[PDB]
Structures are given as C-alpha cells and as structure tokens.
Amino acid sequence: ENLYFQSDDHFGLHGLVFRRTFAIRSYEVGPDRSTSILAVMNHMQEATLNHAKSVGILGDGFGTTLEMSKRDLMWVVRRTHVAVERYPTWGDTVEVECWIGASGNNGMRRDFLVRDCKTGEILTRCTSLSVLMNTRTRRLSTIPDEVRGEIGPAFIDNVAVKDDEIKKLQKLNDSTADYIQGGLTPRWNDLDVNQHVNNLKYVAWVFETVPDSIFESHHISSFTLEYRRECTRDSVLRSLTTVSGGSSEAGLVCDHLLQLEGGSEVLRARTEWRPK
Amino acid sequence: FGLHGLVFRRTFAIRSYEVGPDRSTSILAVMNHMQEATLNHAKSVGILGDGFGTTLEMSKRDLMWVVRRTHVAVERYPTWGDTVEVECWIGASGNNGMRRDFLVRDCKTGEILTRCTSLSVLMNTRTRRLSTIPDEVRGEIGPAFIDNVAVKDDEIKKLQKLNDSTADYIQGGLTPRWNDLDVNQHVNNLKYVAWVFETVPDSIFESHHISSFTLEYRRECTRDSVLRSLTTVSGGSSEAGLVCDGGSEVLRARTEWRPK
C-alpha cells in the first residue's frame, strides 16, 4: 500500500526498496547443512551498500555521504535485531528486501526481509540502528540538515521488526559467566576504512564463548545486539557468555558480553535458541 | 552458472566482506569461490554423490576423495564491484589420481586473474589406506575427464619442510570447533588455510600480495585435535608454511609474495 515500496516498473516511480537474489554457497553452510547466521548477516550487509547506490545516495564510505564526509561524520551501528524463522540450505535461492528509515530525529534504521524464492516464505527479519559519530572526536553527533537532505528522501515508514519484539538488554554478571575467553585481538584485515574493527567481527567474538554443544543442538531464532563502544587495532577483548537453560516452560537463552578486558563494555547481546 | 560441455562456468560478483582494507579480494575468497565451483561442476557432471563428491560406487567400497596438493597462481586480485567468472573441470592425474583445475577471469577484460589445480586420491576411511581407482568409480567420473591444464607441471615445485626449531613465527593451541568440521568429523581444508596465515605477521599482508600458494596435505585432523602453526620467512619474499599436530606434520605450504 506504500507506492514507493514497489519496484520501479510497477508504478513508474523511483522505488526506495532494494532487492537482490542470493544463491546459498557451499562455504556458507555448517555441518548440519544450515546457512550460518553470520552468512545471513553478511548478505544483509552487502544489500545495505547496494541499497544506498540504488536510491541515489552518494559515494562510499560504507556510508558515507559528502555532507557527512565534510563534517568528518560516519555511521556506527548501535543496535541490531535479527529474527530467523528458518535457515536456508545449499543451493537455495533467497531474496533480500532492504530499505532505510528514520529513527527519532538523529537515528537511522535499516530493515531487512529475506525470503525463500521457491516457497515465498520469510526466512529472516532484521533491523539495525545507526547513529552519526565524529571520526576525530569519537563523539556522537546529531544529524545535520545537509545530511538529512541526502538520506531523508529515501526514508519509508515500513518496518520488518516491531518495537514489541525488541527488548532492552541486561548486562550479564561477568564474575559468574559460564564461558569466558580473553586475548581476543583484531588483525589487519579485521579493520574498516577508518581505524575501526569490522561490525561482523564483533559477532564472531560473541560466538567465541558459545559452547559447541549448543551449536549442535539448537538454531538461533533471535539475535539482539547493543553496541556501546568502537574498537581499534590495539584493542584486546574478552568474550563472555551466560546460559539460561531450557528444560521447562523456558527455551534456551544465551546472554553475551564483549568487554575491553578489562573491563569497559564493548557490547551486550542476547540469543534465543530453538531445538533443530 | 552453466556447464559447456564438460567445463563448468560461473560468475561471482565480489562482495564487500571478501575484500580487504586495501580494497583487494583476499586469496581465501578466491579459494571460497573455487570450492563453490567444485561442487557445481560435480553436480552438473553427476558426480556429486552424497552432496560433497562421494559417489555411489565410492561409498560402497568405503572410499572418499582426499586433496593432497593444491597450487594457486594469482596474477591480480579483483576489487569490490568487479565481477569474475570461474572455469572448472576435472581430468585424470596419473593412474589413481584426479586433478581439478580452475581459471578465474574478469568478465569485463577477460584476463585470467587466477589459475589453480588440486590433486585428489581415493582413501579407505576404515583402513586409512590410499586406494587405487576401481573401474566402477572410473566409470562414474571418467567420461567427465578432459586433458586441459590451468597450471603446468613446470610451475609446481615439491615443498621442503621448514625446520620447526628455527621458525620465525609459531602459534600453538589451535583447535577446531563444531562449525570447522565436515560431514565426516574431519576439519575443513579452508580451516587449514586460516591456520596457515595465523603465523604470517600483519606486516606482510600490509606490504605484499600473495602471488603463489602451494599446499601439500599429509593428514587429516579430528574434533579432538590440537595444532601448531609455523612460518619461516625467507625473502624476497617467500615463506614456508608448516602445520603440526605431538609434532606430526599435518601439512606443509609455500607462499610467494610481490609488493602491492
């Protein structure tokens, strides 16, 4: 019912939703033949960058528009929520539907829908919240009008994930964590365009302390991350995970924490699991 | 993607996470592409079998393919936004070996970016003994054989093990996780490559691109394996790879580098 959601040839309008097909590759699936959530998030990240190009948003970046680039501003992801119904397998063809939208006066949200091309079933729903940061002062910035003039006309109001589904996360008690791993350090290729560690590197470090027994038995159905701080090449991190068993009423839950070791919080995260 | 007639072809659009901070595609992304082209080829010539290359006649005789040598030649790494095309095919290699060869081209210029060949042999999973190729299995893969090579014998040198007591860089405690494992409890070959590069200092990745990569595999590892990676740098600019389990050799490898 939103005209600008449809493709260009539907209404003769410049559409604001990017679409792209992915065929699941061999190295993207685990021993259980399921695509990993890291491959799914890779897909959405790739669709992100393509989307900016498709709506007439400027030169990269990974981001980063001119008005932003003039003001030494960059996007930083501060929240991510992923809802997974079913993971595709090798050879399956999926389609990512992605777009951007406002989040208050100074936030921007990117939302994603991934469908199974054969069944038309929705496999993945996601939304990520980004904010502006000054690269020099490492300080959060409001969105200047020159930047709103760039990304604003690309906004649509649709959501893939309702607020109801996203719960504010509690930091786990790091002194009673079920699993802990320190000495985590980024290497040369793990860094981004501006001195900072890749966003999906963080996700990898989160899974460092998830026991293999949970990966063998369960699939991630929900994934929520709250980022609070960037990391550099000389960062050394500690990953922590706390398991909230599922053996009655309650399903399997994992709480997560990346900290600078020690012990300023880098992020907190929460995974919900379902039996395979 | 498409087969024509016994040479499979497939396009990859370079993805962002496949590209490094220098905007160059990593050698592992290239090897990721070929793993993918491998299985596509296999399916299209009808040798995929159980989903990974073990045919009906192979499994009955408890046989599976094992990679024993890989050589990758890279002229230029593609960058983000580039679209590449992979050519893959198989052929006989001696009396009991099978070779898989690869050509990767830039779709715009048509220049060859990467040439590669891998040698596989049959191994009994029960007796741990290399096996000859039974006629029943040759009957399966044989009609798919072609004689072309992407990499000449000339270009591949036998590797010497580095002195593990004189290694410039060493890292132990390397252990595989559940996701690092394949269908039959064994660690994935691209996990090995990751472990190889573990002891290559960031300074070399910053200064140089890999122009050549040669791997000789000796042994498989299991879920309870604990490994040590070793690298010795002898410019300019070569390094000799070694992967140790005790200290029994798992594989040896060799990279040649050129300034970016």
Q: Tell me the domain boundaries of chain A.
A: 1-276
- A50, A194, A198, A199: which one is catalytic? A194
Q: Are B15 and A46 a contacting pair at CB < 8 A? A: yes
Q: Are B21 and A62 a contacting pair at CB < 8 A? A: no
Would you state the structure tokens that stand for residue B146, as one six-digit string?
């072609």
Question: Which CA distances in Å does B145 have to A146, B37, B45, B117?
Answer: 61, 16, 10, 14
H-type alpha helices, B61-176: 135-141
A231 part of the active site: yes
Cβ B39 vs Cβ A26: under 8 Å: yes
Cβ A122 vs Cβ A115: under 8 Å: yes
A194 part of the active site: yes
Residue of chain A minimizing CA distance to B28: A27
Amino acid at A226: E
Residues 6+ apart with CB under 8 A from A105: A142, A143
DSSP letter for A152, please: G
Would you state the structure tokens that stand for residue A159, as one six-digit string?
């959501």
Experimental method: X-ray
Residue B206 phi/psi, 5-degree rounding, is -75, -35
Q: Are A189 and B20 a contacting pair at CB < 8 A? A: yes
Residues 6+ apart with CB under 8 A from B165: none
Q: State the pairing for strand pair A237-244/A179-184.
A: antiparallel
| Residue B170 host element (H or E) | strand B169-174
Residue of chain B minimizing CA distance to A187: B202
Q: How far is A71 from chain B (nearest CA, A)?
A: 22
Cβ B211 vs Cβ B258: under 8 Å: yes
Q: How many Cβ atoms sit within 10 Å of the Cβ of residue A162?
A: 9
Residue A51 phi/psi, 5-degree rounding, is -60, -50
Quick one: which of B199, B211, B219, B203 has its CA closest to B30?
Answer: B211
Chosen from A188, A198, A220 to mutate, greatest number of chain B CBs within 10 A = A188
Resolution of the coordinates, Å: 2.4
| Residue B108 host element (H or E) | none
Cβ B233 vs Cβ B239: under 8 Å: yes
C-alpha–C-alpha distance, residues A273 and A252, integer Å: 5
Q: Are B32 and A25 a contacting pair at CB < 8 A? A: yes
Residue tagged 């993607």 (tokens): B1
Quick one: which of A104, A118, A101, A115 has its CA closest to A44?
Answer: A115
Q: What share of chain A is helix, strand, coil (3-state, %, to 5)?
A: 25, 40, 40
Q: How many Cβ atoms sit within 10 Å of the Cβ of residue A79?
A: 20
Residue A44 phi/psi, 5-degree rounding, is -70, -40
3-state secondary structure of B250: strand
How many cross-chain Cβ pairs, A to B, lie less than 8 Å apart? 51
Residue of chain B minimizing CA distance to A34: B179
Contact residues on chain A for B26, CB-CB shorter than 8 A: 189
Q: How many Cβ atoms sit within 10 Å of the Cβ of residue A139?
A: 9
3-state secondary structure of B208: strand
Cβ A221 vs Cβ A162: under 8 Å: no
